Amino acid sequence: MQLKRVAEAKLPTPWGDFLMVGFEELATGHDHVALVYGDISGHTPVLARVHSECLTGDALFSLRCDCGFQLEAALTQIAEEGRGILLYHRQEGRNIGLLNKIRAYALQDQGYDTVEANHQLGFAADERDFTLCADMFKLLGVNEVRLLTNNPKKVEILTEAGINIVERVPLIV
């Protein structure tokens, strides 16, 4: 357990009110957030999206990735379902950080691909720790998860990270 649940408040959006729950990394004070729509109590598996933060795509209208597009799509789909969770996993640039992400982007501007750029900068293709997501689900009292994603490989990755995924729900985009 790398996190603690510290506060919650209302987050009104165009799709309705989500309960915003803030989590804190015990060792660093770094934050993560979960947006909970409706009543997620009960034994029924809970619909959920794991969204890793991308400042450029999520906030700065970047056209070089689909993160912002996916964020809106997931929130919309969860609200439509009427019950669900979106985890905002704050590990920018597959966990290499924003500044290194800009360095990687500069190399990509020169013809390098994301894997090549990261390698030249001294990082693996993906350095994210998804067990932080398992922590958030556990702290929210969630067991079985219906994971929103169009990539079966992501189901494998998250299951390995300790998330009990019982179904893959295509992300409507």
Compare residues 57 and 145 and give the one whose CB is closer to a copy of itself. Answer: 57
What six digits make up the tokens of 112?
Answer: 């390098």
Q: What letter would DSSP give residue 54?
A: -
d(CA 54, CA 70) in angstroms, rounded, equals 11
The answer to whether 154 is annotated as binding is yes
Please identify, among the stretches 2-10, 122-130, 137-145, 160-168, the one whose residues bind a copy of itself according to the rule CB under 8 A.
Answer: 2-10
- Choose, by CB under 5 A, the member of 36, 47, 54, 104 that binds Zn ion: 54
Give yes or no for residue 106 binding a copy of itself (CB under 8 A).
Answer: yes
Give ∠ CA 53-106-100 in degrees, rounded to 5. Answer: 45
Q: What letter would DSSP give residue 19?
A: E
Q: How far is the CB of 113 from a copy of itself (least distance, A)?
A: 14
Q: Which helix (H) or strand (E) holds 45?
A: none
Q: What letter would DSSP give residue 44?
A: S
d(CA 24, CA 33) in angstroms, rounded, equals 9
Alpha helices in the chain (DSSP H): 55-58, 67-81, 92-95, 98-109, 114-120, 131-139, 152-160
Q: How far is the CB of 64 from Zn ion (least distance, A)?
A: 8
Compare residues 21 and 54 and give the one whose CB is closer to Zn ion. Answer: 54
Give yes or no for residue 26 binding a copy of itself (CB under 8 A).
Answer: no
Which positions are catalytic?
126, 128
Output Rg (C-alpha) for the chain, integer angstroms: 16
Give yes or no for residue 11 binding Zn ion (CB under 5 A).
Answer: no
Q: How far is the CB of 135 from Zn ion (least distance, A)?
A: 23
Annotated binding site: 49-54, 65, 67, 70, 92-94, 114, 149, 154
Positions touching a copy of itself (CB under 8 A) are 6-15, 20, 22, 24, 31, 33, 35, 53, 55-56, 58-64, 68, 71-72, 75, 88, 97-99, 102-103, 105-106, 108-109
Positions touching Zn ion (CB under 5 A) are 54, 57, 65, 67
